Write a protein that binds this ligand. Structure first.
Ligand SMILES: *[C@H](C)[C@H]1/C(=C/c2[nH]c(/C=C3N=C(/C=C4\NC(=O)C(CC)=C4C)C(C)=C\3CCC(=O)O)c(CCC(=O)O)c2C)NC(=O)[C@@H]1C
Ligand SMILES: *[C@H](C)[C@H]1/C(=C/c2[nH]c(/C=C3N=C(/C=C4\NC(=O)C(CC)=C4C)C(C)=C\3CCC(=O)O)c(CCC(=O)O)c2C)NC(=O)[C@@H]1C
Ligand SMILES: *[C@H](C)[C@H]1/C(=C/c2[nH]c(/C=C3N=C(/C=C4\NC(=O)C(CC)=C4C)C(C)=C\3CCC(=O)O)c(CCC(=O)O)c2C)NC(=O)[C@@H]1C
Ligand SMILES: *[C@H](C)[C@H]1/C(=C/c2[nH]c(/C=C3N=C(/C=C4\NC(=O)C(CC)=C4C)C(C)=C\3CCC(=O)O)c(CCC(=O)O)c2C)NC(=O)[C@@H]1C
Ligand SMILES: *[C@H](C)[C@H]1/C(=C/c2[nH]c(/C=C3N=C(/C=C4\NC(=O)C(CC)=C4C)C(C)=C\3CCC(=O)O)c(CCC(=O)O)c2C)NC(=O)[C@@H]1C
Ligand SMILES: *[C@H](C)[C@H]1/C(=C/c2[nH]c(/C=C3N=C(/C=C4\NC(=O)C(CC)=C4C)C(C)=C\3CCC(=O)O)c(CCC(=O)O)c2C)NC(=O)[C@@H]1C
Ligand SMILES: *[C@H](C)[C@H]1/C(=C/c2[nH]c(/C=C3N=C(/C=C4\NC(=O)C(CC)=C4C)C(C)=C\3CCC(=O)O)c(CCC(=O)O)c2C)NC(=O)[C@@H]1C
Ligand SMILES: CCC1=C(C)/C(=C/C2=NC(=C\c3[nH]c(/C=C4\NC(=O)[C@H](C)[C@H]4CC)c(C)c3CCC(=O)O)/C(CCC(=O)O)=C2C)NC1=O
Ligand SMILES: CCC1=C(C)/C(=C/C2=NC(=C\c3[nH]c(/C=C4\NC(=O)[C@H](C)[C@H]4CC)c(C)c3CCC(=O)O)/C(CCC(=O)O)=C2C)NC1=O
Lengths: 174, 169, 67, 87, 161, 158, 26, 157, 161, 161, 161, 157
């Protein structure tokens, strides 16, 4: 959380929190009710967002482990997406991205390499999830929540799309 | 490193004019654009990988010899170094946009950059071109997001170019 | 000089990000008295656990003869 | 970055793989005497930039080496004692 | 370490479920108490050295512990005790701000009791001085904030016992 | 400042500024105008503050080098009081103790021990100045100003 | 210019009556 | 003790005491009678030194916590003066400042800042005590005693 | 660190006598097994990543430890477990080439139990994954080479508990 | 570093010959002067802080160096200059005890001008401070010892220039 | 470590009192034996290698310790034993000079038994070697100095038991 | 041995053994028969090697502790010669001088100085033993053996 980060920074330098850090903490405390409301909103819309995002993702990328005819793989993919939405809600509550980093971002690429899931498929799935979250939430709620999904995407966005050394045609598949 | 407010406050004591009218006016003008600076930084951070990828692809389009044998972007090792360094530049330019001051660029990006690039044979012309491409892509994204008065976004990138480019005239 | 016999386990908190080679984190060693406060603070701030502390060298309550 | 005055950086794995390999020595109390002596020579080569211990008559080294070989102290404490040595 | 938000998040995350309404109520309570916590942290930071001075004066001075043969005899041991009290106060302020005693367990009581036992530091006198520090802080910041800070001071004392 | 602290924290981890840090920075940029108004109030009233506080300080702490008959010592003490009031105003502009700490808190004890000026007398003077300043500020503005006085006092106490 | 002794000239009637005394002393 | 210092100097090189250490040891040993005599002088005249030094120090520094009208504070300051005289006697006996360092010098600033005692006042009191003590012995003994008094004063500064 | 040749040499050296015909027979057996050991080392070096992936899929995935509340929950701990398995495999290959388990004792099993107990790593799951790794290596290299790598994996598992 | 004895030994050693009578006379002069050298070292060690305070008072105070924009502006720079003067005094004492200026060249003057130029420290101002320190020490320890110490103070000033 | 003077000073300082006449008499006794202490230290320094040679020849040679399987077998272990005997002699000389056994407890006997038991060093053989070294030193330096050194030799032997 | 040397070389770089290291390991394990048979001829001819080498060593170095009329000294010298022959056989088996270094080379100078045996005499005896042992085997077999003998002589100087 932000309070934990301030305390760790102060303890590293062996000093009490400065007045500015205390004022930032007070602002964070004052924003707590709105943060909790946003987290509740995200929690209540988890299942429908996941379902719609899965539909869009299967429409986009069919050649995926979650669309290989295995029910276990489909359940696991939907569960992973729900987990990432849950971590984003944790970030909303905590005031920073540390829950996301410490639960689902550090080592995420290594985990998916070991499990066997292509990370571009994960990126496309998360883009679909971000689109669904933007569609469902109000513009303010989206403006507050989407940055964490963009933070997730930034981890698994390189190397990859876009590609510009082409003629722009996508029908070359044959 | 310092941000705009810290530098202005310290200069208030240094120059002996204290908190006079010009300092107050500059502080008010800077604080008017603070929310836009935070928004620009958020846009840059949310689209960093896309910006760097687009800029490097356009750079290799305008410098096709870079990826040919004997070029500096030849092989995936050097390609990855290109992407890494362009990410460095974008990150520190976003820092400078937030702070409103170029001291972060001076202390953590440009100090000794020319020595390193001379040691490693990194060409400065393509470096400046890639920085300008990233600046153009960021401006396009900001216009797409609906931002209107984003002149300050030009300041870091251009500045960095002026600091790294050789003197021609 | 006074020496502490200290057993500790200090796991690395950033080995995934830096991809440093794996190292043994459970150690027992003699730490000089003058460095023990800083060593204990470092272990605590790294999330490690101090298992056992003994005054290996020296006597408690000594007023002189510490050198 | 080790402090707020130091920047954090990233290195692609390709650069590390292509670069020359550092031979890293890990001291283990269960290793044979020759391997421990090799690690100790590495410590001397790093701290003193060269194994100058024999040249300058660093006899006290022997005691330190014993305290390292018997496991009383670690490589960290060995290096700390070397830095505070007269050599 | 952990704070109240991190503790609640981890307790919800080990079950793989969102924060249940009980956890959300606890989070709201912590957010409400945050103003008092920040005020107490500011007050303690503004008076740290005086707090330690008063603690030593009212707990350890003019007792047998500062007389010859006592553990606070000689200037170096007095300075070490004062240093320990400074760290106790700073970490208690950290814990009060975080609303969690985990930092006290990780960075105060982690091997402190064994160090004191090996050094011959009197545990009873240390607990007495920690209680005196709690009393001094209470007299500085009031009864309610003093009680809140005394929660963590008592955690330190119980860990040292 | 908090902007600089956030940028340094992000830089250490080789990452862009996180949404929470950006929210904090936006909040302080929003509060900048209020902090500027408070600092302007401090600056415009600095002469009365120093006058009243110095009279109170010489009343409560008479055995001090400035109160010893030396004109130079008294002038330098008054100049230092004005200097610290202005520094507190500038650090209020910034919004964090960093400028005041960098200019007149780090090494203040060493500087005034080399000058042979008692630091407890300085603590008394800063206390008097803080009281006089609090007399002419609202409680909300005092919540912004007082912690810098306290930081200076803590940095001056031996 | 290795000599600077001319610039080290360093840097009277008291400006206060009865200095370093407290008010209303018994 | 200086004997400990020279033995540790020999041991740091893992080497028997060299002729320099042996010469230092013999020089220290042959002055045992003088050192014991100085220690006896300091012990016998401790109260006289404390009283005279307190008088002179209160004359020089009237505004000090000792003579602020608090009986306990006066007693504590005079006990501190006696303790420092005793530590100087220890240092004279040992031939080195190590007892003084380990009992009354390491952390003296932290201890007295916690007690809120001005360090310059303690320096002035130590100066008065040195002036009183040096007047109760010959010049040769004064040379040894003033060294440790100056050590205390320098540690306070 | 020790290998089969040095182990036999030391066994004969403590007696102060040359290698008896039994020791020479053991030395010859090691020399004949050297070619198979080299082939196994080459195969494991070429397929280390696949071996670790198959081990995780066979033993650790879709169990309680990988579910929330388990020790392999969160991506960081998953990556740490994978790295541990990689080190286990590499040092088992070292021991197989050497013909002795001493390198396992001094490099892998030195302090591993204490670290695992302090961190809460489940030793039973680690032993299960080590056995799964032995099975995977056997399925890759063959039966006899699988047997040798299995004896070294079994030594690792026994050292763990 | 080398002292007077070692300087004479090195002068004789480059020729591969024992100390000639003139070198022996120089050695005896150093041995005879050692007593007043120790006396001067004792006085300087006892009055170091006062010496530096008087040096700053008569050399740097109330000039533009202490004003904003000067190099002693802010308390950190003031304390840094005081620390540099403390270094100068201590190593002048070392050189006076040793009888030669080798320690000053090795520990201080080698690259001090370059460092000061890089940091913007005024060389003329610090030369003036060193000369004021020489006057202060001469006033404290007397004429002959003051001159002996001023030899090394002048060496420092020349090395800065 | 502590010597005789520091031991007396510590014992007196714990009580917070000057040295009583008995302690002053003990201090005078230590002071009047300094010449004998220095002579014994010089003699032992001059004959250290021969002393260790005689000790090894008298207590350890041509036994099962030096035979294969014994702890003094192989050149490295023989050298380690000789090194340990040299350490014992040198630190006994240090203790004789200091008039106190604190140096032995702080730099020789601190956990020596634990390391010896861990490595399998025969403690009985070591004690026999210490007795042999005491006898050799007594035969070299005389009866009085021999007994003085034997005090610390017996302290080492008791610490090893 | 060679195997542990290759494995430690690979371990210090945190990587599996390289193909060249594997090839060296295979070439080494191929020569196991030759190493075993050389060790066998070294063990069977140890007594005659000791006798002839001691005879030559006493011929060229008569003023030595073994040739001083002491039965036990001569017996222990010949025992040492046999022990070093055994250590060289160990080194031949292992393919490297590691057994010899671990058992009878590290600390050899300290041990023999404690015994007051001149080191030059032992070097001469080792040279005599080497020249005696090299004559009882093929020149191809000698390449290893002589090297190990040199390792004893270099370490003893
Ligand atoms: C003061 C309340 C009491 C007291 C204290 C005392 N402590 C020491 C020595 C040490 N104290 C510590 C403590 C800590 N280490 C940590 O990591 C933390 C958490 C922040 C703490 C509190 C340590 C490590 C030491 C030893 C190392 C060192 O001091 O640098 C002493 C000195 C003991 C001695 O024998 O010299 C003392 C006196 N003693 C009392 O009697 C008080 C009741
Ligand atoms: C007044 C409340 C107290 C006091 C002050 C006093 N100061 C001086 C002299 C100096 N003060 C400064 C101060 C500063 N230097 C800096 O860089 C800053 C910025 C944070 C400050 C405030 C300096 C540099 C000096 C030296 C002289 C100069 O300005 O060049 C004096 C005179 C000391 C002397 O020996 O002349 C005095 C008296 N005195 C009191 O009694 C008050 C407690
Ligand atoms: C007298 C020269 C100055 C002075 C002194 C003063 N001291 C106290 C109280 C204490 N002094 C000590 C001192 C020591 N403790 C040690 O271990 C050593 C090393 C041997 C020393 C010197 C201590 C511990 C105390 C606290 C009380 C106690 O003894 O338990 C006071 C009273 C403080 C109070 O607030 O009560 C005073 C006044 N004051 C001066 O003005 C002189 C310059
Ligand atoms: C995977 C099979 C199981 C698992 C592993 C796991 N381990 C850790 C933590 C550490 N593991 C090590 C390993 C080693 N130390 C050594 O000396 C060696 C020999 C070279 C090895 C292999 C270490 C040092 C640690 C500490 C952390 C660090 O990286 O330094 C974790 C992480 C624990 C945590 O994050 O709290 C995990 C997950 N856990 C399981 O559940 C699997 C069955
Ligand atoms: C005081 C007389 C003048 C003065 C000094 C000043 N120096 C610094 C900074 C540094 N000074 C040093 C000096 C040394 N390096 C060495 O190795 C030695 C030999 C022992 C010396 C004396 C160094 C290394 C620094 C840089 C490190 C640091 O900043 O501490 C400052 C501070 C400069 C700043 O910008 O902060 C000052 C003020 N300045 C004057 O104006 C005086 C005339
Ligand atoms: C000789 C009398 C007996 C003997 C000795 C022996 N000792 C070791 C190993 C060690 N000896 C020490 C002792 C010290 N090291 C120090 O620094 C000091 C203080 C100055 C002492 C007393 C230690 C620490 C060790 C362990 C480290 C090391 O290997 O040196 C050995 C080697 C044992 C082994 O190979 O593991 C030996 C042989 N052994 C006998 O049989 C004699 C009776
Ligand atoms: C013969 C070539 C030379 C020589 C030898 C000599 N040796 C001794 C006595 C001993 N030799 C050893 C040798 C070893 N111990 C080991 O651990 C190893 C490594 C495996 C070796 C080689 C030892 C331990 C002894 C001591 C007695 C014992 O074995 O118990 C003597 C006797 C000396 C004496 O009695 O003082 C001699 C003479 N002498 C020569 O002149 C040859 C050059
Ligand atoms: C909170 C941190 C965390 C994460 C993220 C995590 C993920 C995770 N997802 C898994 C499975 C899986 N995950 C997916 C997911 C995907 N397939 C697709 O097509 C999508 C693009 C993608 C969505 C992310 C699939 C298909 C499987 C099944 C793989 C298999 O059956 O082998 C597994 C292995 C089996 C299991 O444990 O159930 C793990 C460990 N574990 C953790 O502890
Ligand atoms: C080890 C030697 C080596 C190789 C080969 C390599 C490949 C390589 N291929 C690239 C691009 C590319 N490569 C391909 C195509 C393909 N590539 C294939 O190997 C397929 C056969 C084929 C698809 C069927 C395309 C389409 C691009 C352009 C991608 C873009 O739009 O950016 C690039 C990026 C630079 C550029 O765009 O010019 C590299 C570095 N790098 C190396 O260091």
């Amino acid at each position: 959380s932000i309070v934990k980060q301030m305390i760790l920074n102060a303890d590293e330098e062996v000093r009490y929190l400065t007045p500015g850090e205390i004022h930032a903490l007070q602002n964070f405390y004052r924003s707590g009710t709105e943060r909790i409301r946003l987290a509740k909103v995200l929690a209540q819309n988890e299942k429908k967002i996941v379902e719609r995002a899965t539909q869009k993702f299967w429409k986009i990328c069919p050649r995926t482990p979650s669309n290989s005819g295995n029910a276990r793989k489909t359940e696991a993919a939907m569960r992973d997406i729900g987990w990432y939405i849950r971590l984003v809600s944790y970030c909303l509550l905590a005031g920073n991205e540390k829950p996301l980093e410490e639960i689902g971002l550090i080592g995420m690429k290594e985990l998916y390499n070991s499990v066997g899931i292509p990370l571009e498929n994960v990126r496309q799935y998360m883009l679909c999830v971000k689109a669904e979250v933007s569609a469902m939430l109000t513009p303010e709620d989206a403006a507050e929540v989407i940055p964490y999904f963009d933070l997730i995407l930034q981890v698994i966005s390189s190397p990859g799309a876009p590609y510009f050394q082409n003629n722009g045609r996508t029908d070359w598949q044959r | 490193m310092q941000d705009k407010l810290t530098s202005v406050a310290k200069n208030c004591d240094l120059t002996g004019s204290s908190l006079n009218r010009e300092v107050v006016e500059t502080l008010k003008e800077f604080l008017a654009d603070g929310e836009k600076r935070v928004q620009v930084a958020g846009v840059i951070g949310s689209n960093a990988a896309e910006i760097v990828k687009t800029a490097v692809s356009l750079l290799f389009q305008e410098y096709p010899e870079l990826v040919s044998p004997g070029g500096n972007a030849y092989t995936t090792r050097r390609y990855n170094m290109y992407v890494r360094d362009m990410n460095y530049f974008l990150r520190y330019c976003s820092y400078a946009i937030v702070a409103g001051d170029a001291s972060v660029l001076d202390e953590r990006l440009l100090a000794g950059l020319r020595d390193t690039f001379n040691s490693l044979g990194i060409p400065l012309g393509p470096t400046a071109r890639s920085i300008q491409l990233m600046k153009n892509i960021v401006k396009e994204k900001l216009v797409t997001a609906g931002m209107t008065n984003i002149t300050f976004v030009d300041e870091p990138f251009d500045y960095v170019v002026r600091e790294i480019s050789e003197t021609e005239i | 000089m006074r020496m502490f016999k200290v057993t500790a386990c200090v796991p690395s908190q950033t080995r995934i990000r830096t991809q440093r080679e794996l190292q043994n984190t459970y150690f027992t060693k003699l730490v000089p008295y003058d460095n023990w406060f800083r060593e204990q603070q470092r272990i605590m701030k790294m999330g490690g656990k101090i298992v056992k502390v003994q005054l290996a060298t020296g006597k408690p309550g000594m007023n002189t003869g510490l050198l | 970055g080790v402090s707020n005055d130091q920047q954090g950086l990233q290195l692609p794995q390709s650069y590390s793989m292509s670069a020359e390999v550092r031979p890293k020595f890990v001291f283990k109390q269960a290793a044979t005497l020759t391997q421990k002596q090799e690690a100790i020579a590495a410590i001397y080569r790093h701290v003193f930039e060269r194994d100058v211990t024999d040249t300058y008559g660093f006899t006290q080294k022997a005691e330190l080496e014993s305290q390292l070989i018997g496991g009383n102290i670690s490589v960290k404490e060995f290096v700390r004692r070397l830095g505070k040595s007269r050599l | 370490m952990q704070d109240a938000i991190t503790a609640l998040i981890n307790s919800s995350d080990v079950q793989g479920r969102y924060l249940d309404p009980s956890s959300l109520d606890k989070l709201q309570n912590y957010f409400q108490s945050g103003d008092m916590r920040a005020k107490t942290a500011i007050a303690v930071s503004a008076n740290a050295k005086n707090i330690v001075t008063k603690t030593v004066a009212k707990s350890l001075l003019y007792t047998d512990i500062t007389a010859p043969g006592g553990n606070m005899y000689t200037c170096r041991r007095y300075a070490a005790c004062v240093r320990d009290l400074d760290y106790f106060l700073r970490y208690a302020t950290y814990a009060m701000l975080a609303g969690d005693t985990s930092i006290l367990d990780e960075r105060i009581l982690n091997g402190l009791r064994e160090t004191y036992n090996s050094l011959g530091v009197p545990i009873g006198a240390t607990i007495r001085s920690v209680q005196a520090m709690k009393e001094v802080v209470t007299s500085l910041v009031g009864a309610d904030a003093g009680r809140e800070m005394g929660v963590y001071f008592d955690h330190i004392a119980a860990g040292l016992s | 400042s908090i902007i600089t602290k956030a940028i340094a924290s992000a830089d250490r981890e080789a990452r862009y500024l996180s949404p929470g840090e950006l929210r904090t920075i936006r909040d302080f940029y929003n509060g900048g105008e209020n902090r500027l108004r408070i600092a302007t109030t401090l600056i415009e009233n600095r002469k009365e503050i120093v006058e009243r506080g110095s009279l109170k300080f010489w009343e409560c702490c008479p055995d001090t080098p400035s109160n010893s008959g030396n004109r130079t010592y008294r002038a330098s003490c008054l100049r230092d009081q004005d200097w610290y009031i202005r520094l507190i105003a500038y650090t209020v502009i910034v919004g964090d103790v960093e400028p005041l700490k960098d200019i007149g808190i780090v090494g203040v004890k060493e500087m005034y021990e080399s000058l042979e000026i008692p630091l407890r007398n300085w603590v008394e003077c800063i206390r008097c100045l803080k009281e006089v300043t609090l007399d002419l500020l609202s409680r909300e503005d005092a919540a912004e100003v007082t912690p810098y006085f306290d930081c200076l006092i803590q940095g001056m106490i031996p | 210019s290795p000599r600077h002794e001319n610039q080290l000239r360093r840097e009277t009637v008291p400006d206060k009556y009865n200095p370093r005394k407290a008010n209303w002393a018994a | 003790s200086i004997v400990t210092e020279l033995i540790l100097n020999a041991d740091s090189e893992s080497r028997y005491p060299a002729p320099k250490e042996i010469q230092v040891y013999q020089n220290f040993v042959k002055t045992g009678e003088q050192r014991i005599r100085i220690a006896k002088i300091l012990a016998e005249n401790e109260q006289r030194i404390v009283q005279n030094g307190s008088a002179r120090f209160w004359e020089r520094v009237p505004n000090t916590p000792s003579n602020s009208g608090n009986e306990r504070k006066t007693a504590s300051c005079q006990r501190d003066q006696g303790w420092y005289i005793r530590l100087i006697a220890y240092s004279v006996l040992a031939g080195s400042e190590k007892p003084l360092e380990e009992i009354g010098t390491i952390g003296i600033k932290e201890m007295y800042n916690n007690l809120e005692i001005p360090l310059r006042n303690i320096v002035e009191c130590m100066r008065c005590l040195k002036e009183e003590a040096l007047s109760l012995m010959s010049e040769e003994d004064a040379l040894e005693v003033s060294a440790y008094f100056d050590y205390v004063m320098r540690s306070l500064s």
